[PDB]
Amino acid sequence: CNTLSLVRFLELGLSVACVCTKFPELAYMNEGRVQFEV
């Protein structure tokens, strides 16, 4: 007959740092090319 049925949680901040780049919004896509010129 008691409460304390609660826990809380989230995870961000470092969740962008190690990722170390981002393109969002991939649409209906088939091929992704990146070419290098050195």
Binding site: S5, V7, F9, E11
Partner: protein, 49 residues
């Protein structure tokens, strides 16, 4: 509400069991007592004054 690290690959899907677990309360005695002599019964009441 345990976390999920929901996976890539064709290994099948994670499933959040946000279960309610119960516990059980015990019962304890903690008894104590103290004496009282054959006198001080008339005393502390008002008989033998």
């Amino acid at each position: 509400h345990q976390p999920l690290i929901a996976r890539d690959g064709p290994h099948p899907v994670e499933q959040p069991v946000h279960n309610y677990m119960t516990k059980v309360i015990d019962r304890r005695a903690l008894n104590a007592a103290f004496s009282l002599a054959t006198e001080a019964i008339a005393l502390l009441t008002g008989e033998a004054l």
